[PDB]
Amino acid sequence: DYNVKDFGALGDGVSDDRASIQAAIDAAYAAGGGTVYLPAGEYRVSAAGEPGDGCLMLKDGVYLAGAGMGETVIKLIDGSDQKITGMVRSAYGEETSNFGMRDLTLDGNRDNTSGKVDGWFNGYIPGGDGADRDVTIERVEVREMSGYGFDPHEQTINLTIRDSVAHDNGLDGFVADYLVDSVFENNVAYANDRHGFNVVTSTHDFVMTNNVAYGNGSSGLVVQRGLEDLALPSNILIDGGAYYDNAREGVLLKMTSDITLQNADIHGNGSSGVRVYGAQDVQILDNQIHDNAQAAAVPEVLLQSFDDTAGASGTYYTTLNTRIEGNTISGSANSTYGIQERNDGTDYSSLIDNDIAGVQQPIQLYGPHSTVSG
Ligand SMILES: [Ca+2]
């Protein structure tokens, strides 16, 4: 255990405490691991060097701990004008283990800086054989980043992010880039320019419990393959929470499979409450999907296939085996259907015991093997 102030950190909202804080981290590391504590206050930091160096470099066994969100604030210095891949991060090309941070706030100060800045970043090597392991983030707030809020990256095994908040960031509040056997729980993402939550790049065996996303510039939560022709994310459980008042969809599932969305409240979104776009074996169970299509004539729940024949994969992602059961669906004045399949090859949808109401038309299926009951 080390108090950054014992290493020269002032936390006066002006002085550059980077070196001090980094010194404390290095001491903990050398001691084989420990907690680096930062008393209440605003600690300014500058880029450590190249983008990949971020601001603060965590290492095996080291954890950061503040006096609580909003109480302890690490903020980028005014005038900073370079790309910073993670104000707090782990080393590229190194498999870092047993580390994290809690009870503090990372402020990207994007109003007074330039360059893509991400709050948190960690991982090994994109496309490389290796991963960070055993990472825990608790009660941390990330805000004002010009880039991503929380960006745990390829590859990270057994990561846990809970009771945290990401808001007012340039891109996505939370990203799950190739996370494995990990968990996102009781987190909140709002006012981000793009997505609240963006699960991408082969992430799998991932659980998202009771997370909330609202007021985001795009989708509340999206699970997608990404730009590259890589193994699709799969085996993901979205259990509970709420995704509402987002610019686009509440929940978007694109070029993915084996996803279960259950017990969630989805409302007030610009587009569809739930959109399945080129995915297979998706289960939409016991959700409250209502009052969406606030900005467009779309259905509360949309099912369609994704044509990527001219894209990276040269594949036509046919949507198959979508189970929609036990949901309560009511539209807005614009909601076209309760549930709709596009006549694009999407097939084998199973609609079972769904209460639909307040829409121009309850259901519309086209798949020759798609069924409806109740
Ligand atoms: Ca690392």
UniProtKB/Swiss-Prot annotation:
Q: Where in the cell is it found?
A: Secreted
Q: Remarks, anything else? A: Each enzyme of this family of C5 epimerases introduces its own characteristic sequence distribution of G-blocks in their substrates, explaining the extensive sequence variability of alginates. These alginates of varying composition have different physical properties and are necessary at different stages of the bacterium life cycle.
User: What does the entry say about activity and pH?
Assistant: Optimum pH is 6.5-7.0.
The species this protein belongs to is Azotobacter vinelandii
Q: Organism's domain of life? A: Bacteria
The reaction(s) catalysed by this protein are: [(1->4)-beta-D-mannuronosyl](n) = [alginate](n)
Which molecular-function annotation in GO is an example for this chain? isomerase activity
User: What are its GO biological-process terms?
Assistant: alginic acid biosynthetic process
Q: What is the name of this protein? A: Mannuronan C5-epimerase AlgE4
- Which family does the entry's similarity section mention? Belongs to the D-mannuronate C5-epimerase family.
